[PDB]
Amino acid sequence: ASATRVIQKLRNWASGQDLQAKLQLRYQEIAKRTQPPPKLPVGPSHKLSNNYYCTR
Amino acid sequence: MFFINILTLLVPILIAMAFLTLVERKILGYMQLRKGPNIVGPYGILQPFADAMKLFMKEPMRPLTTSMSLFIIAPTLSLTLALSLWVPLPMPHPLINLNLGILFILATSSLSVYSILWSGWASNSKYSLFGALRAVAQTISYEVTMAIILLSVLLMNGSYSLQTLITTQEHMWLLLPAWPMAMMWFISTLAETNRAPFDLTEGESELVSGFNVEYAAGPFALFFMAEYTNIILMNALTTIIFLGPLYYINLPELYSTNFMMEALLLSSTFLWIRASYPRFRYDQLMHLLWKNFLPLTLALCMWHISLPIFTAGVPPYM
Amino acid sequence: EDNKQFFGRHRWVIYTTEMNGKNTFWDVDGSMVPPEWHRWLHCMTDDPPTTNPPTARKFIWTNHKFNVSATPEQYVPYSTTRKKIHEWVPPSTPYK
Amino acid sequence: MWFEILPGLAIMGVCLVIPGVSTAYIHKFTNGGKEKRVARVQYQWYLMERDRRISGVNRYYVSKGLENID
Amino acid sequence: RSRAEYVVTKLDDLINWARRSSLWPMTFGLACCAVEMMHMAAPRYDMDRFGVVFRASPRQADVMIVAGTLTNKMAPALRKVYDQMPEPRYVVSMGSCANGGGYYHYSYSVVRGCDRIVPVDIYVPGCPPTAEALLYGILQLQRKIKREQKLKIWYRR
Amino acid sequence: TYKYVNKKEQESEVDMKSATDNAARILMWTELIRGLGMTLSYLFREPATINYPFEKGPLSPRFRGEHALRRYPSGEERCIACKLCEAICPAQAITIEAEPRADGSRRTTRYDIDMTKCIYCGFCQEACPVDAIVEGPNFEFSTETHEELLYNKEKLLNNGDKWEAEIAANIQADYLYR
Amino acid sequence: EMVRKCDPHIGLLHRGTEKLIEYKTYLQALPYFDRLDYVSMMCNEQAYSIAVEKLLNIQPPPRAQWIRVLFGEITRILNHIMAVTTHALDIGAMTPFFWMFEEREKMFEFYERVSGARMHAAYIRPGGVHQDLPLGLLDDIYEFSKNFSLRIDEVEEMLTNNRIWRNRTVDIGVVTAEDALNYGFSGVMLRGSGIQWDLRKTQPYDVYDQVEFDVPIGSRGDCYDRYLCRVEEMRQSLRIIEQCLNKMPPGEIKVDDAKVSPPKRAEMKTSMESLIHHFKLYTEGYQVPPGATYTAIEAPKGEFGVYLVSDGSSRPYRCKIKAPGFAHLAGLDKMSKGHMLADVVAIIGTQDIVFGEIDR
Amino acid sequence: MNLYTVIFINILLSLTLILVAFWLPQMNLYSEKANPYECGFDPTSSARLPFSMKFFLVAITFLLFDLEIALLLPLPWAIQTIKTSTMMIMAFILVTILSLGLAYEWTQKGLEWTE
Numbered sequence A: 001a002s003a004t005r006v007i008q009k010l011r012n013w014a015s016g017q018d019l020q021a022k023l024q025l026r027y028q029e030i031a032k033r034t035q036p037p038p039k040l041p042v043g044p045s046h047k048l049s050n051n052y053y054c055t056r
Numbered sequence B: 001m002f003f004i005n006i007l008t009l010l011v012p013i014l015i016a017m018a019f020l021t022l023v024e025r026k027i028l029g030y031m032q033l034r035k036g037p038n039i040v041g042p043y044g045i046l047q048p049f050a051d052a053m054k055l056f057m058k059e060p061m062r063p064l065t066t067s068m069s070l071f072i073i074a075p076t077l078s079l080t081l082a083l084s085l086w087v088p089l090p091m092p093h094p095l096i097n098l099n100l101g102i103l104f105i106l107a108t109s110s111l112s113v114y115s116i117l118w119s120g121w122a123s124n125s126k127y128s129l130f131g132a133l134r135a136v137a138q139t140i141s142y143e144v145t146m147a148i149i150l151l152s153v154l155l156m157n158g159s160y161s162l163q164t165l166i167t168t169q170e171h172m173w174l175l176l177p178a179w180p181m182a183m184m185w186f187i188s189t190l191a192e193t194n195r196a197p198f199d200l201t202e203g204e205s206e207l208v209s210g211f212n213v214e215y216a217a218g219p220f221a222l223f224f225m226a227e228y229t230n231i232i233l234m235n236a237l238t239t240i241i242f243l244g245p246l247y248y249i250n251l252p253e254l255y256s257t258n259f260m261m262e263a264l265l266l267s268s269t270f271l272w273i274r275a276s277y278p279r280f281r282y283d284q285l286m287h288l289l290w291k292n293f294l295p296l297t298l299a300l301c302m303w304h305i306s307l308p309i310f311t312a313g314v315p316p317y318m
Numbered sequence C: 001e002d003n004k005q006f007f008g009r010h011r012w013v014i015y016t017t018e019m020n021g022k023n024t025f026w027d028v029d030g031s032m033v034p035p036e037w038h039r040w041l042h043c044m045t046d047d048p049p050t051t052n053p054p055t056a057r058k059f060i061w062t063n064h065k066f067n068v069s070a071t072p073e074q075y076v077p078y079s080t081t082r083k084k085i086h087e088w089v090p091p092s093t094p095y096k
Numbered sequence D: 001m002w003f004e005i006l007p008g009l010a011i012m013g014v015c016l017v018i019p020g021v022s023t024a025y026i027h028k029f030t031n032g033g034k035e036k037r038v039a040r041v042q043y044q045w046y047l048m049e050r051d052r053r054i055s056g057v058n059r060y061y062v063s064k065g066l067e068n069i070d
Numbered sequence E: 001r002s003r004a005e006y007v008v009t010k011l012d013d014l015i016n017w018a019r020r021s022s023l024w025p026m027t028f029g030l031a032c033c034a035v036e037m038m039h040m041a042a043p044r045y046d047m048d049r050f051g052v053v054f055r056a057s058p059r060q061a062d063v064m065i066v067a068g069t070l071t072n073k074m075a076p077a078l079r080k081v082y083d084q085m086p087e088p089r090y091v092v093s094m095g096s097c098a099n100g101g102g103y104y105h106y107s108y109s110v111v112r113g114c115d116r117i118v119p120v121d122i123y124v125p126g127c128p129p130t131a132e133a134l135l136y137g138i139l140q141l142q143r144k145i146k147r148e149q150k151l152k153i154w155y156r157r
Numbered sequence F: 001t002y003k004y005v006n007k008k009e010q011e012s013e014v015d016m017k018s019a020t021d022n023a024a025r026i027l028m029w030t031e032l033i034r035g036l037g038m039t040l041s042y043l044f045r046e047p048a049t050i051n052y053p054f055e056k057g058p059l060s061p062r063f064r065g066e067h068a069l070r071r072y073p074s075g076e077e078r079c080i081a082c083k084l085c086e087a088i089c090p091a092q093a094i095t096i097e098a099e100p101r102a103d104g105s106r107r108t109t110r111y112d113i114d115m116t117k118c119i120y121c122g123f124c125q126e127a128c129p130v131d132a133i134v135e136g137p138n139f140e141f142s143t144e145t146h147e148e149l150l151y152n153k154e155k156l157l158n159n160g161d162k163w164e165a166e167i168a169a170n171i172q173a174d175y176l177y178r
Numbered sequence G: 001e002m003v004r005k006c007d008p009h010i011g012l013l014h015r016g017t018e019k020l021i022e023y024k025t026y027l028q029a030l031p032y033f034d035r036l037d038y039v040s041m042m043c044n045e046q047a048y049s050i051a052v053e054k055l056l057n058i059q060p061p062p063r064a065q066w067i068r069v070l071f072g073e074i075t076r077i078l079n080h081i082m083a084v085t086t087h088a089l090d091i092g093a094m095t096p097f098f099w100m101f102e103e104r105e106k107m108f109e110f111y112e113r114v115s116g117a118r119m120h121a122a123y124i125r126p127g128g129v130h131q132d133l134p135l136g137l138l139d140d141i142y143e144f145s146k147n148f149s150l151r152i153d154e155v156e157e158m159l160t161n162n163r164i165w166r167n168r169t170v171d172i173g174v175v176t177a178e179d180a181l182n183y184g185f186s187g188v189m190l191r192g193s194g195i196q197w198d199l200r201k202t203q204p205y206d207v208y209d210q211v212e213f214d215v216p217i218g219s220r221g222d223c224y225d226r227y228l229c230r231v232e233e234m235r236q237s238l239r240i241i242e243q244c245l246n247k248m249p250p251g252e253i254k255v256d257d258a259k260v261s262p263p264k265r266a267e268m269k270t271s272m273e274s275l276i277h278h279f280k281l282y283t284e285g286y287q288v289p290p291g292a293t294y295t296a297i298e299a300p301k302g303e304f305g306v307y308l309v310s311d312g313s314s315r316p317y318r319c320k321i322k323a324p325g326f327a328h329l330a331g332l333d334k335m336s337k338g339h340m341l342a343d344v345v346a347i348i349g350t351q352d353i354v355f356g357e358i359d360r
Numbered sequence H: 001m002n003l004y005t006v007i008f009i010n011i012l013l014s015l016t017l018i019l020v021a022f023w024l025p026q027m028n029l030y031s032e033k034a035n036p037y038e039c040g041f042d043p044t045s046s047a048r049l050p051f052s053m054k055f056f057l058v059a060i061t062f063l064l065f066d067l068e069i070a071l072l073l074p075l076p077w078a079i080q081t082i083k084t085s086t087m088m089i090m091a092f093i094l095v096t097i098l099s100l101g102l103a104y105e106w107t108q109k110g111l112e113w114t115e
């Protein structure tokens, strides 16, 4: 992403593809390495009634 | 003073060969989205010396089934013929000035093929035998085609000397009149030097290592030096023949600089081609050089027989 | 760190020239990183252990040790259990 | 980046310009400020041997002009 | 000490520098660990940048990276290609299989660690060890053969 | 549904312009030239090589590395010698012996992990009911002898004491998912 | 250099995997399948998990099924990258190997972020998957996949129209459709010979009947057609990855049945039933009712089958692993008739052969 | 004399390199070290057995074509002749005859490899 415009035009002409739109090196678009804590949902059997195991 | 001239030819060619190995590693790495050697030395520049020292301090192999005499004889023969092929090139003044320079080149190249063949037969192994037979087929195809190519080019040039080629390209490159046979000569030099896609003797994936699969350490280093010196040699021959550097009588340093730049560009093109293409099959190489290159080479040889006759541009004898 | 660099090369460490009495001017080691900077350097979190220090415990090592293989400080395995079968000790006085 | 190749390329360039330049300078030094004479034919070789005999020092490159003619 | 001892130590340093800067592994692998080995060859880690380049023939190899499960049917072949390597040779066991059998330790057809067959210089643990860990093992081997004192021991003989 | 990867539909017939284009393609090596151009573009790109060991590849808090035995904040060992890790270990890489301690606590007298036998699967750390055994994120612990990878309780407790500043943070970042 | 006979001696990577599996429990036998086909780890996990779930008569939750399909397609991309690029490396070109292995490194980062292991995840389990996805993983998968087709276009530009590659691959190892059916080929071999067959379309599993994709079909049955099929189904795998990212549902991760899947750690540490079930699942394991099944899954290398026989206990009585590479390598000698050494190298490359699943 | 000197210098340099390569490193050779290489297993048969050649006809044709090259090589001095018409006709006849031989072999499948 630090390539000069001359080298970018040279690479794009040599490959035939617009390489700068789809770079194979990740710079900033990736997720942050620290994330907010999750709160995972519970399954369908997490209920206090009508949940006898013989019926499922 | 002549011995000093021998030294200042031989030693810089060897250092240029070693840094050609380094620059192949760097260029292949940067074409393969990696870096290549930059740790051993400042920018990797001590890596070839490290490799040379490691190979010359590793023990050599002397297999029980192996014919010792030819096993020893082949790598030193290969290195001597590489340096001998280097000796008569004019930049713009050769160390040894010959009349039949390209004939000397052809003879020494065929003898280098014999070095490969004797290595493959002496190393009594089946992969070495495969490498020797593939070398036989390869040199058959490129020998006939390259001989006709060089014949047509020198028919345009007029003599077998190479200072005569400098004088021929004083005003214009031979690439413009002879660019189809320049392409065929480039492919022939690839096959002569055993570079991808026409390597086929040090077959990494098909064989294990081919003709030098039983060679280790020092003799293997000699083979590698001979091959890469031949790479720089054939690219130097290509730029002397086809891409004529600017020659001025008052200063030859401009010729040496232009020759160096074009030879570096052609060597980098060799590394570029090795990166780009997959390997041929060795019957397809023969079919190519005998069915596509050879008929066109014969036609262009007839054309270059006719061309000075009907243009009255017959080249001078001297 | 340098966030203009791409992912992977955006954080780096210049190792010390000496750690635990070993001259690491050339012999740099990947295990010389203490665990908190190891987490930041391997990018499991975005914050360094200067704005977010780890929890202090009294049993946590105050001095990090690198890989001590092929050194006198290396680890040697042994059975950590005591003897299970106890042999009978003969008396030290003769019968006659 | 791609310019890390340039140190090895520069070493190759110096090691390729050394042989030709050194050969030209050694030819000039050993032939006394002139290029080494090329005898591609017997006529040119005879010219070189005649110059060697004419010079009187058994060196062909010591040319004699009009100072030898009265 | 003696002046010749210093010269011998410097020659030892030079030889060790050459041998650790030029480490060519045999193109030899057995399993998933060899998949991680070519992921070390991959552009992220660049063993070629470290000076480490695969060679197919064991005659041109310096180190042997045993990367995978060494079986009973494979053990004579592994010993053969180890023996065909020239003398300054090293062995890097990679992964739990090559270290001590691993997940197939109690199998009828698995050698319980390649150290029963070849002398192993460096053990790299993992299943698979990451390419980072294999590169760490390679650098540790470079340090180990930097520590070698062959000419100094020869002089002290 | 399906599609054809090599079958051609109908024909393009024959034309002088098309014949000349195919002739130029065969003679002038056009696809070979554009392959060269692709490699040239890659040459002028930026390499994806990190500067190991000064730069490390990214990881996650879930990463399964070198084993360690943790403690409570009081300093008491978390392990209660329940042998669930030994029972679930797919490689049988864990050996556990135990007895009541001098204070009557249920503690191990032998906790060995054969790291040459272990497959680094995390079943021990996900079967441990008290988060005693963990796979801390250390992976650069290669040794020069086979013996040094045969860990015992002292080695595992030393690893837990060494890596507690990082293991606790990883478990803090991870435990809501598990 | 002509090849008169091929005799593939195998078993040099045989480790008695089926015997060890029958001596271990089901959860203990799960990470063997990571090491059967060590390029298709999640796919073998999915195959074994579907076999055990069929024997257990339980189904994973829909979010687990969508995660399993997404990672199966990521694994298919990984395996076809390995197949195509190492085939090209055996032919002689290594630059696509380096580029696509950088891409493989990114997908290994995805594997490590979900499971903690780059290759042997042991993530897909009977009842679903082990853990939920960490936050931002779907965004990173999208960022990878939106740029990946350009890299495929790069390899395709490098190889597909190259006359050298066409000479090396066209009319090499030609297999007729009837011969492929009789030799028992599956996956890429049948579709290269032109047989319209894919298990994901014919006998779908998880939510492959809900995703939409095309099946690449060859017409000449050679190495070039098989290579084109692998590249095109890499593109189709990218298409399925996009669909999975857009249609990932909310919900749980394991089946809500603590007698098969372990409970959450908080529930285990706060509840008696959850602690008992955690203890029994991680010591004895769940008892599978006795019965035999053959579960076949469209692995990237072909049909990956598990013939599981359960005697009613918590350990499998018998576990036969059917690998496509076994039948393909059995058929290697037929494909190499009238060919040379380099042609044999090309055929071994195009058969998509890994030896862990062959030898077991 | 100079060419002979530089050839001898190359010979001495390569002999010195191979001599120091054989006498400098430490020797440790045994039977398994020096057994031939067959990818880890013993060779089934010796490598001195007959090894079939599928391009033998192309090799014989290469002999004849190489002599055609030897005939064509004095052309750069032949073009200096007074009677350029005779030289041009003879060169055309030679190259045409060579091309007709190549075309006949291509038609009769001699360039194709056996089996």
Ligand SMILES: COC1=C(OC)C(=O)C(C/C=C(\C)CC/C=C(\C)CC/C=C(\C)CC/C=C(/C)CC/C=C(/C)CC/C=C(\C)CC/C=C(\C)CC/C=C(\C)CC/C=C(/C)CCC=C(C)C)=C(C)C1=O
Pocket (backbone or CB within 6 Å): B014, B015, B018, B021, B025, B028, B048, B049, B051, B052, B053, B055, B221, B222, B224, B225, E026, E027, E028, E029, E030, E031, E032, E034, E035, E037, E038, E041, E048, E053, E054, G039, G086, G094, G353, G354, G355
């Ligand atoms: C899934 O299934 C499986 C597979 O299937 C896919 C497998 O495959 C498989 C097996 C797996 C493996 C074996 C892993 C192997 C890994 C790979 C195949 C990927 C790695 C890729 C490559 C090998 C391709 C590399 C490509 C390159 C371009 C790199 C370049 C390499 C080269 C060999 C060329 C460069 C040359 C060298 C490095 C050596 C050059 C240098 C010298 C020899 C030095 C010579 C110089 C001198 C002697 C000069 C001396 C003279 C002087 C004057 C010097 C002056 C000196 C002074 C001291 C003054 C397994 C197990 C498997 O399960």
Ligand SMILES: CCCCCCCCCCCCCCCCCC(=O)OC[C@H](COP(=O)([O-])OCC[N+](C)(C)C)OC(=O)CCCCCCCCCCCCCCCCC
Pocket (backbone or CB within 6 Å): B175, B180, B182, B183, B184, B186, B187, B197, B238, B242, B273, B277, B288, B291, B292, B293, B296, F026, F027, F028, F029, F032, F033, G163
């Ligand atoms: C030194 C100077 C520069 C040289 C070029 C260097 C840069 C380019 C390098 C490219 C990479 C090469 C890597 C190796 C490639 C190997 C493959 C290969 O080249 O195969 C050869 C290919 C082979 O093609 P093919 O094999 O695909 O074709 C199929 C053929 N059959 C079916 C028979 C098998 O091409 C040639 O053989 C062409 C050679 C050059 C021809 C040039 C003709 C020019 C025009 C002449 C005049 C026309 C008009 C006449 C007058 C009309 C008047 C009206």
Ligand SMILES: CCCCCCCCCCCCCCCCCC(=O)OC[C@H](COP(=O)(O)OCCN)OC(=O)CCCCCCCCCCCCCCCCC
Pocket (backbone or CB within 6 Å): B076, B077, B080, B081, B084, B097, B098, B099, B100, B104, B107, B108, B111, D039, D040, H001, H003, H004, H007, H008, H011
């Ligand atoms: C390891 C063993 C290797 C054995 C093989 C060695 C190969 C050497 C390199 C390849 C040689 C190929 C053949 C070359 C033959 C001569 C080529 C030539 O054209 O020479 C002519 C030239 C001068 O002639 P011309 O160009 O007409 O100039 C006249 C006006 N200037 O120059 C001359 O007239 C000079 C005549 C002599 C030139 C050749 C000298 C060879 C020296 C002997 C080498 C072998 C020594 C024996 C083995 C030693 C131990 C191994």
Ligand code: SF4
Pocket (backbone or CB within 6 Å): E031, E032, E033, E034, E067, E068, E069, E094, E095, E096, E097, E098, E102, E103, E126, E127, E128, E129, F119, G035
């Ligand atoms: S240690 Fe694990 S990853 Fe390595 S070869 Fe064995 S099973 Fe595969």
Ligand code: SF4
Pocket (backbone or CB within 6 Å): F085, F088, F089, F090, F091, F092, F093, F094, F113, F117, F118, F119, F120, F121, F122, F123, F124, F125
């Ligand atoms: S990670 Fe798996 S194999 Fe290793 S000790 Fe834990 S349970 Fe055993």
Ligand code: SF4
Pocket (backbone or CB within 6 Å): F078, F079, F080, F081, F082, F083, F084, F085, F086, F096, F124, F127, F128, F129, F130, F131, F132, F133
């Ligand atoms: S599972 Fe945990 S508490 Fe139980 S024996 Fe193992 S480490 Fe100790």
